């Protein structure tokens, strides 16, 4: 399957017009991974930093492309994005003000991304771990090394740990390559195709736990593991073939169950204690309201909050507005914090009060934007 990218351009901190800030271009929910993301100043291309390819639960990809600084003095900035799902490159300009609408547990995840031979310019194998959506480990088929993605990961883990997993990943990389070939032979096609794996567990706020192991082919769910019944789910006749093979090995299934239920949860708690400083902190949001003519729409921004769990909506006198509204979703700030936003198109009438409702610590925060 092929899914068009969602794009949002915004600033790390609220622009002071005299104060250099970070321009961000966030591209998410796209597939395949092939992506061209450029930042533009008045139409010209600018030197910008790009994050490692990251993976979501739905098998899509996302990237944060940021610029060194944007003093923002009487200029016009935008973002250019080229993708296989776009004929003409989509351009999104940065405004003083779409998509979104997606909307306190802890989890650990490990992702794999295979790319059918040849390389196609992209690394054929990639593996990255996440805890609470925080990057921790990074491996790829180019540089075959372990590589911690967090400071508190590398500090609390000896060199013998990374040495051991740098060897395992090389083994898993090769096995992944073989399964990718086998699939293409089963689907009776060749050329560019992708192979993805996601495993992990999560620890719920009350002490409950769950775990999952899943596989995707070309962005679509392929094989899904049930650790309770010790059986694999297949949504395709071709996926059914692997199902019958994998289920034939009982020791493997049992092994998966134990890791997800016992081993994984242990790794999660261990990592949480390591990053206790970063993960257990909470920084309140800074709300900002603005308006743009042409009939007019209102904007509400919430800056620099952690964790990402947040709820934000517009109100009218003083009830919530479900009509003519947009949700930015949770966006990476780049500081390790996050920011979002919500907009409303107004038929203003007379004497109506419009105010922004935000709940973070909950801790309900309301800012009155506008009234006739």
């Amino acid at each position, epitope marked *: 399957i092929q899914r068009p990218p969602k794009i949002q351009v915004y600033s790390r901190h609220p622009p002071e017009d005299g104060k250099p800030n970070y321009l961000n271009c966030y591209v998410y929910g796209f597939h395949p991974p092939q992506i061209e993301i450029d930042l533009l100043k008045n139409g010209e291309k600018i030197k910008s930093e790009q994050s490692d390819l990251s993976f979501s639960k739905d098998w899509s990809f996302y990237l944060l492309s940021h610029a060194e600084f944007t003093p923002n003095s009487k200029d016009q900035y935008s973002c250019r994005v080229k993708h296989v799902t776009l004929e003409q490159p989509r351009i999104v300009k940065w405004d003083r003000d779409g998509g979104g609408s997606g909307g306190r547990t802890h989890s650990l995840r490990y992702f794999r991304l295979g790319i059918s031979e040849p390389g196609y310019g992209i690394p054929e194998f990639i593996s990255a771990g996440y805890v609470d959506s925080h990057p921790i480990t990074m491996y790829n088929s180019v540089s*075959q090394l372990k590589e911690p993605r967090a400071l508190w990961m590398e500090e609390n883990l000896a060199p013998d*740990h990374w*040495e*051991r*997993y740098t*060897q*395992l990943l*090389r*083994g*898993w990389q*090769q*096995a992944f390559k073989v399964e990718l070939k086998q699939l293409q032979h089963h689907y009776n096609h060749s050329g560019f195709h992708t192979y993805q794996r996601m495993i992990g567990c999560e620890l719920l706020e009350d002490g409950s736990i769950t775990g999952f192991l899943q596989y995707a082919y070309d962005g679509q769910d392929f094989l899904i593991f049930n650790k309770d019944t010790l059986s694999w789910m297949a949504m395709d006749n071709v996926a059914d073939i692997i199902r019958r093979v994998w289920e034939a090995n009982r*020791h*493997e299934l*049992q*092994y998966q*169950k*134990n*890791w997800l239920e*016992e*081993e994984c949860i*242990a*790794w999660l708690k261990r990592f949480l204690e390591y990053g206790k400083d970063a993960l257990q902190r909470t920084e309140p949001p800074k709300v900002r309201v603005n308006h743009k003519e042409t009939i007019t729409t209102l904007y509400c921004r919430a800056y620099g909050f952690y964790p990402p769990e947040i709820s934000i909506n517009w109100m009218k006198n003083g009830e919530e507005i479900f009509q003519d509204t947009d949700y930015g979703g949770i966006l990476p700030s780049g500081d390790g914090t996050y920011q979002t936003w919500v907009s409303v198109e107004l038929d203003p009438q007379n004497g109506d009060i419009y105010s922004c409702h935000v709940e973070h610590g909950g801790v309900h925060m309301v800012l009155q934007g506008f009234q006739e």
Partner: antibody
Amino acid sequence: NIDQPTEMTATEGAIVQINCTYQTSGFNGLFWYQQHAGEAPTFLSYNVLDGLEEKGRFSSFLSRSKGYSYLLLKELQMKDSASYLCASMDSNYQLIWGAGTKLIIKP
Amino acid sequence: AGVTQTPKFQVLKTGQSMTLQCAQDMNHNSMYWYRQDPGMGLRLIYYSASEGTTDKGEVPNGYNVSRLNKREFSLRLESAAPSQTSVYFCASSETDPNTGELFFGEGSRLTVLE
């Protein structure tokens, strides 16, 4: 660390139980190998979840809470005389081998 | 099929170089080299997850290793020592982690005399 009885003697046709205790960081499984004298070991059983795994005359029990396992040999034949190796996996997938239990079967 | 290992017997004067041959017909990925001694569970000297990569084990000291093909993993000791007298097992598994069923070579009997 992993421990099992050094030597065990039993008569042919009888039943025998070889205990194996292990203390490791994590647990990814526990293996039993049979190794005849002067020969290469052979895979016997693999246990991860708590319970009993029976194959023919052989059965392998595991307790993850107790860190305990036993290989249970029923209806002992002469060919059963061998060394029986016990091994388990760490949190990392490394394998720890116990010095086996030499089983001597008297006719 | 199975893991093939040679030689099965060697006597060496200390200081001599010798290499043990191991080949796997099972199209596996991971390969190991084990040393078995009396009163001790098997120890891993060296292993490889797949072809093109190898890494030291519990007791790498005095040993080297190489993966030629996906089929072959050879154990090399450049300078023989009396402490290296043992029965060397070359083992092969389809993939790491899961060793079982782990396949062992016939075994290689090594005695090093001054």
